[PDB]
Amino acid sequence: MSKIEEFLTAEEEKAIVDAIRDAEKNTSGEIRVHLEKTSEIDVFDRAMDVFHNLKMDNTKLQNGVLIYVAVEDKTFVIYGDKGINDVVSDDFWDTTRNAIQLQFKQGNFKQGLVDGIEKAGMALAKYFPWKKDDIDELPNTISKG
């Protein structure tokens, strides 16, 4: 809070990263978060350039998700790859935004992102159930601008 150099302490980032690792064992899709301060153009186009710049489309099922959050304006954008978008609808995405939006609205960025990942993993698991041979295409480390 007072320190703006680090949005979350190692204890805070440690718990959210662990949540992502557990989701990769519940579904073959991949969820990743990118945190930056403010942009100079549009966040939707900016997240698309960063998502492709980071090669997050390098997945066999094309089911990777990048969460772009602007802590300067307290906003968040969710962009999944063509694989998640082609298999789920806006209604399947609506629960994702309500969980992150409700926690962000309270001021707790970590609880919103962690709870959003949990709901996303169970919802995604319905479309892609975890198989014993499931492979982890993406890491769980948080991305920062």
Side-chain angles (χ1 to χ4, degrees):
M1 295 183 290
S2 181
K3 291 180 179 180
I4 61 169
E5 181 67 7
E6 293 296 339
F7 287 97
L8 299 178
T9 65
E11 183 180 14
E12 294 297 309
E13 292 179 359
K14 185 179 181 181
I16 188 169
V17 175
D18 275 355
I20 294 169
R21 289 178 179 180
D22 275 355
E24 293 177 355
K25 297 174 180 177
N26 290 342
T27 189
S28 77
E30 294 297 350
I31 296 171
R32 185 175 188 181
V33 170
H34 178 82
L35 188 64
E36 184 179 347
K37 294 178 179 180
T38 173
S39 303
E40 181 178 345
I41 56 164
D42 290 345
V43 178
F44 181 74
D45 275 355
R46 183 175 178 88
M48 183 173 68
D49 275 337
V50 173
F51 189 112
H52 291 241
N53 278 205
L54 299 176
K55 220 174 177 178
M56 291 180 70
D57 292 305
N58 65 357
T59 51
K60 294 176 182 178
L61 299 177
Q62 297 181 298
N63 52 6
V65 173
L66 186 58
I67 299 168
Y68 189 95
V69 173
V71 296
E72 295 297 341
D73 297 352
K74 221 173 180 179
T75 62
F76 64 87
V77 171
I78 305 172
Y79 182 51
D81 190 6
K82 189 178 181 179
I84 291 166
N85 282 347
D86 275 351
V87 69
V88 304
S89 71
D90 182 357
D91 191 346
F92 179 80
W93 265 73
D94 192 15
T95 55
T96 312
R97 290 178 179 190
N98 283 341
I100 293 169
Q101 176 179 61
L102 180 58
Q103 290 298 307
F104 261 81
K105 186 178 180 181
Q106 292 174 3
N108 208 140
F109 298 160
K110 179 185 179 186
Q111 291 180 6
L113 291 175
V114 175
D115 275 340
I117 292 166
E118 182 178 15
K119 291 180 177 180
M122 289 175 71
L124 289 168
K126 185 178 181 178
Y127 285 87
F128 304 92
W130 187 80
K131 295 178 180 176
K132 187 177 181 178
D133 297 333
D134 184 66
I135 35 58
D136 192 21
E137 294 179 359
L138 244 66
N140 295 282
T141 311
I142 298 168
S143 285
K144 291 180 177 179

